[PDB]
Amino acid sequence: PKVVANKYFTSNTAKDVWSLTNEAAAKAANNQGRELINLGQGFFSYSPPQFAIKEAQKALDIPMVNQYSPTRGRPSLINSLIKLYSPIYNTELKAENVTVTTGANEGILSCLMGLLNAGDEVIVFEPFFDQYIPNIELCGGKVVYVPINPPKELDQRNTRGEEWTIDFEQFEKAITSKTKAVIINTPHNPIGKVFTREELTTLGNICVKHNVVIISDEVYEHLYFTDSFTRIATLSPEIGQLTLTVGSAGKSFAATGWRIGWVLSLNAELLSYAAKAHTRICFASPSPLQEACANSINDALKIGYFEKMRQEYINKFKIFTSIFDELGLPYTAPEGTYFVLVDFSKVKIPEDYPYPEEILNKGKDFRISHWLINELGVVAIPPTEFYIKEHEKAAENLLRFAVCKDDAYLENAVERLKLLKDYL
Amino acid sequence: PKVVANKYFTSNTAKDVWSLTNEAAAKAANNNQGRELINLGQGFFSYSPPQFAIKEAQKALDIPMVNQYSPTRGRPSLINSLIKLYSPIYNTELKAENVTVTTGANEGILSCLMGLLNAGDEVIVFEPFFDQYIPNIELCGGKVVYVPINPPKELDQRNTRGEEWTIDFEQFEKAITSKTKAVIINTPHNPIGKVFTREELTTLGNICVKHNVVIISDEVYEHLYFTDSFTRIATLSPEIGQLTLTVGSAGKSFAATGWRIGWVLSLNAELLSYAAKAHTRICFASPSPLQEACANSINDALKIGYFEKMRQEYINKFKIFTSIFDELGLPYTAPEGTYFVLVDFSKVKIPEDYPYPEEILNKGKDFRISHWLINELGVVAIPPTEFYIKEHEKAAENLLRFAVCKDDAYLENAVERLKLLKDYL
């Protein structure tokens, strides 16, 4: 039959970067004698820590833990979060300041749905997280894009996080009477940038001045390599009253398939809206995993797991970034996350290399990623997918690498990438 | 500060049935002083899922990658078990493209609606409706259109059958416009317990193919039926199947409501793809360990007759429970499926001046009957008028919904307490 479906889906038919990257990989395994090395997957290749696994198996042995949890979450998990974040915020947080969602992505969607009215505007920073766009638009929202500008020096030397910056003048100028909120991602995916207390302080105050809700995506909150990680909500009472901070159990415990997340806010009424939306979207989040997470947070604090994970990742990047320092390719040292942006502009690719008709329209990186897969057998992600075409040139030379793999895998990627010397 | 939230939530402020019932049970626990309350208002199991499912779940957690994101449409393993389970039921060798895993049936129904709806579209629901249907439809820009499932005229004279509750199909078809995108059919029905027949579903389906209206069949209770057969509308005719999206629920099938794993199937691959795309944008991927647990639990269930075992177990639960209404002379609609039962309380002599909170004076009568029952007997039941639009409400104003998804002992204890109704004749 000829059913008319939602126009939002029928009018957006283009393959996305995963779909296109998977096809290229699919075919490049032709590289025979070689196994493709995938650094394009933004999720861990290994298992969650054993203590996490054990808590989940125990939880399943508790009859009612297998049934619907209260809509805002299991008290046990809301309590482990109260315990964990109360010291961080300097408040004796209560249940009203916490709400559990089915992962950070649906937690963000719950924030957007509880706050948006047809026509409303939401600002996002480029390179943005792919899910942000449909979440906002599916809630009747209009997306506004202000870039996280690269360093002019981006492709001559290795850059830092604080070198990618937002034009807070340009940002305060995108705010209108239709602006309901702004999504801020720190540590940033894919820049790895950890927004500073002042970069964040300015934003915070701008928004309280313009009464704009701050939806803060802090899923990589535990994965930072700077002396400190600043939470914009803990900056100044007024900012905190306008901030909804999202976290992820999956990214925290290397269990992306668990689908447990949470949203915290000092402004309980603001939060009630995300909570009510969550109730109407998912109703309740996975029960056995909520209990596992409640106990894992405690197991984690007791054994210094987060610090240990941060060191493991400092190591992983030491292993990985080394070949780029050797090859001469600049990159922005990650301040957090397990993502790294490498400039491939200096790589000499045949000006007549054969690319699919599907990517000639795309920015440069889509072709670089394609070549790299067919020629070196290494999968990397082109970041211009997280841009609006007109703001996209500032990164058409970059590639995103995800190092959430075990050390050995990373070292073998470094060896394969030595072939990048056959192209200066 | 002063932030304008979504008006949808700021406009719908009234307390729902759950809040009211819970409150009433609170102030009533005092009085009931030495009497524990009997809660038959909870629509979810009070016990653990079968030990075989529990074990599949703990085992699944030991496979590393099973703890990371699963493919957006579902883990192949679960899709395979679903293809294996339904291919014989349908009459096709179903493929991955006819199956899609969602985070429970509720969010799968939402995914279906979000993939098909455009601003202004209309979706028809049948009263009494499942609660989540309304916001799911409206949050996606839909306008809900209500058509009641009419109760038998003998409803409060004698026990009735699910088959006696009927949709007025001329009224239904007459409610279809060019704006009508889909209709939601829930069978076995929550809460009548009605198992729509092959004939009821044939006529419903033929009407839908005639007006090109998508059928969203909520069949989470597909395994919990007491009739000879359970008709799946999508298997009635190729034309009906092409307009149908059928929903299932791992939590309702395996007594595991906290797992949040469901699925949507359709012979129309393109129709299904829209539900899948929506799911991808709503939750991205469903819980991985539990999908794997479900993949295997489905295989275990077929090799041990688990679904048949649970049907018998529920036939017994109702036999235990309904027997008191037979002895008391209170008519009910014998359930044809589900673990819900609608019982008529119109005969109960509740004092005409009995006090009720201002909050429920405007509510259908059943809300007050529920209030009274909690206070005077310490038994919790839900007023089904919550699942009606006010203008169609009357037809169920004398009913109370009970849910027997409790263990036999608890049910037998409920029966003993309910004998007290004898004093109110």
XYZ file of C-alpha atoms in Angstrom, chain A:
424
model
C 0.000 0.000 0.000
C 0.991 3.644 -0.424
C 1.277 4.766 3.163
C 2.421 8.309 3.732
C 5.000 8.058 6.537
C 6.459 10.853 8.673
C 7.996 13.378 6.238
C 10.956 13.664 8.551
C 12.020 10.145 7.550
C 10.870 10.036 3.924
C 12.533 13.374 3.069
C 15.922 12.439 4.606
C 17.039 9.450 2.499
C 20.828 9.976 2.394
C 23.176 7.346 3.728
C 24.940 8.541 6.883
C 28.661 8.201 7.705
C 28.352 4.793 9.418
C 26.406 3.290 6.570
C 28.837 4.679 3.993
C 31.925 3.778 6.022
C 30.641 0.228 6.545
C 30.130 -0.271 2.817
C 33.627 0.909 1.964
C 35.129 -1.302 4.675
C 32.819 -4.087 3.462
C 34.423 -4.001 0.009
C 38.034 -2.959 0.816
C 38.551 -6.370 2.403
C 39.805 -7.156 -1.092
C 43.900 -5.983 1.666
C 43.657 -9.761 1.263
C 45.937 -11.375 3.781
C 45.264 -8.389 5.973
C 42.536 -7.864 8.549
C 40.819 -4.509 8.581
C 41.711 -2.418 11.631
C 38.667 -0.500 12.831
C 39.212 2.673 14.834
C 35.890 4.030 13.593
C 33.724 2.278 16.205
C 32.969 4.711 19.009
C 32.351 1.916 21.541
C 34.587 -0.405 23.580
C 35.820 -3.655 22.046
C 36.252 -5.268 25.471
C 34.076 -6.267 28.469
C 32.836 -4.041 31.341
C 34.891 -4.444 34.530
C 34.182 -7.798 36.129
C 32.646 -6.185 39.223
C 30.003 -4.643 36.952
C 29.234 -7.975 35.367
C 28.895 -9.673 38.753
C 26.514 -7.013 40.131
C 24.283 -7.494 37.068
C 24.211 -11.288 37.498
C 23.332 -10.875 41.221
C 20.627 -8.353 40.442
C 18.889 -10.874 38.176
C 18.526 -13.223 41.137
C 16.252 -10.718 42.886
C 12.663 -11.453 41.702
C 11.214 -7.907 41.638
C 14.376 -6.449 40.248
C 13.166 -8.136 37.048
C 9.958 -6.086 37.073
C 9.176 -2.447 36.164
C 11.146 0.102 38.160
C 9.553 3.372 39.417
C 9.428 5.718 36.406
C 12.131 8.084 37.642
C 14.380 5.179 38.586
C 15.154 2.591 41.228
C 15.706 4.214 44.637
C 18.936 2.216 44.935
C 20.356 3.844 41.811
C 19.002 7.307 42.605
C 20.696 6.837 45.984
C 24.038 5.758 44.534
C 23.904 8.844 42.317
C 22.944 11.133 45.223
C 25.952 9.763 47.126
C 28.254 10.145 44.117
C 27.260 13.650 42.998
C 26.457 15.374 46.295
C 30.181 16.031 47.005
C 30.702 17.256 43.417
C 27.785 19.652 43.548
C 27.968 21.148 46.999
C 24.403 20.216 47.815
C 22.683 17.507 49.810
C 20.948 16.301 46.624
C 17.587 14.582 46.924
C 15.550 12.263 44.656
C 13.958 15.330 43.089
C 17.331 16.346 41.698
C 17.907 13.003 39.948
C 16.213 11.014 37.226
C 17.298 7.823 35.468
C 16.902 7.435 31.713
C 17.458 4.666 29.159
C 20.918 5.814 28.283
C 22.233 9.342 27.873
C 20.805 9.694 24.346
C 17.228 9.059 25.336
C 17.896 11.125 28.487
C 18.797 14.084 26.244
C 15.763 13.432 24.073
C 13.676 13.418 27.285
C 15.139 16.814 28.167
C 14.293 18.186 24.731
C 10.773 16.768 24.692
C 9.892 18.101 28.111
C 10.987 21.626 27.167
C 10.251 22.229 23.458
C 7.219 23.772 21.719
C 6.776 23.847 17.927
C 9.015 26.599 16.576
C 11.374 26.646 19.570
C 15.102 26.946 18.824
C 17.996 24.877 20.186
C 21.641 25.722 19.613
C 24.242 23.001 19.171
C 28.008 23.324 18.734
C 29.827 21.830 15.719
C 31.210 19.184 15.435
C 28.009 17.998 17.105
C 26.825 14.594 18.332
C 24.763 13.065 15.521
C 21.773 12.159 17.736
C 21.293 15.802 18.733
C 19.776 16.790 15.421
C 16.887 14.331 15.151
C 16.197 14.570 18.900
C 15.685 18.298 18.605
C 13.809 18.224 15.316
C 11.645 15.253 16.231
C 10.424 17.362 19.174
C 9.251 20.124 16.855
C 12.504 22.032 17.422
C 14.689 24.107 15.086
C 18.464 23.632 15.335
C 20.864 26.582 15.449
C 24.544 25.945 14.672
C 27.468 27.942 16.118
C 30.900 26.308 15.529
C 33.722 25.289 17.858
C 36.419 26.994 15.795
C 39.676 25.124 15.089
C 43.023 26.654 15.876
C 44.400 28.628 12.898
C 47.523 26.552 13.631
C 45.434 23.361 13.298
C 47.535 21.801 10.546
C 51.201 22.631 11.200
C 51.739 21.503 14.807
C 49.914 19.425 17.407
C 47.097 21.410 18.975
C 45.441 21.462 22.396
C 41.848 21.368 23.537
C 41.562 24.954 24.749
C 42.731 25.970 21.253
C 39.382 25.054 19.701
C 37.062 27.851 20.824
C 33.515 29.144 20.659
C 32.909 32.711 19.537
C 30.799 33.700 22.562
C 30.009 36.942 20.785
C 28.725 34.960 17.813
C 27.038 32.631 20.268
C 25.219 35.370 22.177
C 24.107 36.568 18.726
C 22.416 33.281 17.791
C 20.254 33.527 20.904
C 16.791 34.892 20.158
C 13.349 35.086 21.720
C 12.724 31.622 20.221
C 15.813 30.089 21.901
C 14.811 27.458 24.431
C 18.169 25.837 25.083
C 21.741 25.050 24.134
C 23.430 21.645 24.124
C 26.979 21.697 25.477
C 29.149 18.543 25.215
C 32.135 18.231 27.564
C 34.435 16.338 27.322
C 33.656 16.887 23.639
C 33.012 14.182 21.090
C 35.053 14.194 18.718
C 37.479 17.008 19.677
C 38.304 15.462 23.038
C 38.228 19.058 24.253
C 37.489 19.649 27.938
C 35.764 23.022 28.205
C 37.501 25.214 30.784
C 35.953 26.724 33.870
C 36.066 30.099 32.127
C 34.917 28.929 28.706
C 32.089 27.361 30.667
C 31.710 30.283 33.057
C 31.060 32.697 30.229
C 28.436 30.392 28.637
C 26.774 29.814 31.979
C 26.282 33.506 32.685
C 25.191 34.297 29.128
C 22.413 31.725 29.413
C 21.210 32.943 32.836
C 21.147 36.432 31.317
C 19.088 35.138 28.368
C 17.214 32.549 30.494
C 18.351 29.698 28.240
C 18.358 26.137 29.576
C 21.752 24.408 29.511
C 21.544 20.735 28.511
C 25.026 19.522 29.401
C 26.185 16.237 27.786
C 28.800 14.936 30.190
C 28.857 11.224 29.403
C 32.650 11.307 29.242
C 32.793 13.090 32.610
C 35.090 10.398 34.028
C 37.334 10.264 30.964
C 39.441 13.451 31.206
C 43.229 13.891 31.264
C 43.385 17.458 32.508
C 43.999 18.382 36.133
C 40.279 18.846 36.527
C 36.904 18.415 34.852
C 34.509 21.278 35.375
C 30.776 20.824 35.508
C 29.052 23.958 34.236
C 26.153 23.354 36.652
C 28.422 23.742 39.695
C 29.677 27.161 38.572
C 27.142 29.682 39.944
C 23.688 29.167 41.583
C 21.850 30.836 38.679
C 23.557 28.637 36.070
C 22.824 25.503 38.084
C 19.145 26.437 38.164
C 19.114 26.359 34.371
C 21.300 23.279 33.844
C 20.289 19.679 33.134
C 23.402 17.520 33.248
C 23.350 14.109 31.530
C 25.543 11.121 32.362
C 26.022 7.601 30.905
C 26.484 4.255 32.724
C 27.557 2.722 29.425
C 30.389 5.172 28.772
C 31.359 5.162 32.486
C 31.497 1.399 32.902
C 32.416 0.399 29.354
C 28.992 -1.210 28.918
C 27.458 0.800 26.095
C 24.846 -1.907 25.569
C 23.351 -1.432 29.033
C 21.228 1.651 28.136
C 21.199 3.294 31.599
C 21.754 7.029 31.916
C 20.725 9.900 34.176
C 19.927 13.575 34.246
C 20.675 15.745 37.267
C 19.559 19.256 38.072
C 19.524 21.601 41.020
C 16.248 22.964 39.604
C 13.834 20.134 40.374
C 10.979 21.696 38.369
C 13.158 21.961 35.291
C 14.031 18.250 35.766
C 10.428 17.157 36.304
C 9.824 18.006 32.648
C 12.567 15.643 31.398
C 11.266 13.022 33.838
C 7.650 13.313 32.635
C 8.847 13.081 29.012
C 10.905 9.965 29.836
C 7.760 8.419 31.312
C 5.920 8.985 28.027
C 8.801 7.803 25.851
C 10.145 4.712 27.628
C 8.106 4.616 30.850
C 10.802 2.922 32.945
C 14.464 2.011 32.361
C 15.953 -1.553 32.428
C 15.574 -2.755 36.044
C 18.331 -5.394 36.497
C 20.918 -3.020 35.017
C 19.792 -0.097 37.186
C 20.493 -2.216 40.274
C 23.837 -3.380 38.802
C 24.753 0.262 38.155
C 23.739 1.385 41.676
C 26.104 -1.194 43.158
C 28.815 -0.691 40.527
C 29.042 3.034 41.312
C 29.796 2.032 44.924
C 32.207 -0.755 43.877
C 33.861 1.792 41.573
C 34.417 4.449 44.259
C 35.687 1.853 46.728
C 38.383 0.614 44.326
C 39.435 3.762 42.466
C 38.143 2.411 39.152
C 37.615 5.769 37.427
C 41.151 6.972 38.149
C 42.497 3.600 36.964
C 40.495 3.952 33.749
C 41.843 7.467 33.163
C 45.419 6.175 33.438
C 44.649 3.286 31.111
C 43.486 5.763 28.521
C 46.445 8.084 28.990
C 48.465 5.024 28.144
C 46.358 4.099 25.107
C 46.795 7.552 23.581
C 50.529 7.461 24.324
C 50.671 4.294 22.274
C 48.428 5.639 19.521
C 49.360 9.306 19.052
C 53.026 8.312 18.836
C 52.937 7.283 15.201
C 51.439 10.638 14.204
C 54.213 12.488 16.002
C 56.589 10.262 14.033
C 54.795 10.599 10.680
C 54.541 14.368 11.052
C 50.742 14.557 11.034
C 49.350 17.113 13.485
C 46.450 16.219 15.786
C 44.622 17.758 18.741
C 45.846 15.949 21.834
C 42.673 14.736 23.575
C 41.835 16.489 26.816
C 39.238 13.784 27.444
C 37.220 10.971 25.764
C 38.749 8.149 23.708
C 38.528 10.125 20.438
C 41.342 11.866 18.578
C 41.166 14.233 15.565
C 44.145 13.824 13.214
C 44.915 16.177 10.327
C 45.524 14.212 7.141
C 45.978 17.222 4.832
C 49.679 16.480 4.386
C 48.863 12.997 3.034
C 49.567 12.710 -0.695
C 46.667 10.834 -2.348
C 46.557 10.407 -6.155
C 44.706 13.510 -7.390
C 42.805 10.989 -9.545
C 42.011 8.313 -6.965
C 38.718 6.485 -7.768
C 35.953 7.432 -5.279
C 32.262 6.357 -5.195
C 29.690 8.664 -6.760
C 28.167 8.851 -3.297
C 31.050 10.815 -1.742
C 32.210 13.296 -4.415
C 29.616 15.687 -3.011
C 31.034 15.190 0.500
C 33.852 17.099 2.139
C 37.472 15.981 1.682
C 37.754 13.793 4.776
C 35.061 11.442 3.373
C 37.418 10.701 0.499
C 40.501 10.502 2.722
C 38.699 7.983 4.987
C 37.697 6.042 1.880
C 41.242 5.921 0.510
C 42.692 4.946 3.906
C 40.304 2.008 4.119
C 40.938 0.689 0.624
C 44.682 1.369 0.705
C 45.847 0.839 4.305
C 42.858 -1.113 5.586
C 42.320 1.290 8.467
C 38.824 2.605 9.254
C 38.590 6.187 10.556
C 35.574 8.505 10.662
C 35.238 11.750 8.675
C 34.104 14.448 11.143
C 32.447 16.776 8.632
C 29.361 14.571 9.091
C 28.959 16.430 12.374
C 28.858 19.759 10.562
C 26.513 21.902 8.518
C 27.920 21.986 4.953
C 28.505 25.734 5.060
C 30.532 25.524 8.316
C 32.315 22.302 7.320
C 35.533 23.395 5.587
C 37.277 23.986 8.895
C 37.683 20.204 9.273
C 37.535 18.641 5.852
C 41.108 17.438 6.456
C 40.547 15.736 9.782
C 39.830 12.139 10.671
C 38.386 10.837 13.929
C 40.049 7.854 15.599
C 38.512 6.002 18.540
C 41.037 4.263 20.841
C 38.548 2.365 23.008
C 40.287 -0.955 22.186
C 42.887 -2.977 24.053
C 46.520 -1.886 23.918
C 47.681 -4.691 21.577
C 45.062 -3.749 18.986
C 46.249 -0.154 19.149
C 49.887 -1.094 18.715
C 49.040 -3.133 15.623
C 47.137 -0.144 14.218
C 50.255 1.963 14.754
C 52.283 -0.547 12.749
C 49.795 -0.690 9.862
C 49.688 3.134 9.858
C 53.432 3.192 9.223
C 52.477 2.558 5.608
C 51.444 6.212 5.637
C 55.096 6.942 4.911
C 54.569 5.692 1.353
C 52.595 8.912 0.890
C 54.738 11.353 2.911
